[PDB]
Amino acid sequence: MKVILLEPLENLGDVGQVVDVKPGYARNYLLPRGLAVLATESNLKALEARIRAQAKRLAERKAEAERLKEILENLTLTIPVRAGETKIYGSVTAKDIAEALSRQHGVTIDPKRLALEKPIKELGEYVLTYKPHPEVPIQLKVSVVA
């Protein structure tokens, strides 16, 4: 008897997988414990309706990240800081970089989504990895000048 697993299970199959079980197992264990559902045609395409709705909401977000990847690797964030020859007096933090990004180029950015542990204390040119969604890591070239 074909059923739709509603959870991963012991040597049975992954969630959403359609598996064949003895009818007794389905009627008196899986179904009354919400662990699965009989693969009737009605809620059988309701499965592919979801495999469609999620796959549309995933590929969407892997697209709305490229709409920042190509829009960030085609600029530079130049940040002025009062600094003596090399060393910044204050610093530039993630929040600073974000605040400066929305300042000049309007781009809004999650500073916690930016890979920078210690605040920058040196002048120079920096390339900092941004992660707005994995497998789309952005290389932001930033320029702390004086």
């Binding site: 009627r27 179904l31 009354p32 009989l38 009737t40 009605s42 809620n43």
Partner: protein, 97 residues
């Protein structure tokens, strides 16, 4: 055993025919009937307990139509069955037949 609530199957009267002798198709003189008498054939009735709208419902149904019960449980999801008596839940469920 009475009546399938789903299919309507009820006991039927059948004969029990006792035969002797070698069938003609095996080279015998033929079969002879040493007795016919009435008997009954019963549906393979079983209980099916399901839980619908937080109530327990029991069906007396022939094994053949056990699948038809859960099919009603599916079709009952689009119904507003809360607060109804278990007896009234059954009536509604059977209405979808």
């Amino acid at each position: 055993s009475k009546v399938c609530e789903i299919s309507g199957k009820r006991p039927i009267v059948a004969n029990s025919i006792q035969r002797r002798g070698k069938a003609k198709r095996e080279g015998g003189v033929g079969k002879k009937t040493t007795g016919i008498s009435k008997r009954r054939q019963y549906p393979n009735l079983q209980k099916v307990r399901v839980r619908v709208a937080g109530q327990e419902i029991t069906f007396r149904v022939a094994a053949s139509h056990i699948p038809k019960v859960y099919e009603l449980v599916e079709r009952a999801k689009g119904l507003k069955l809360e607060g109804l008596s278990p007896k009234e839940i059954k009536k509604e469920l059977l209405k979808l037949l």
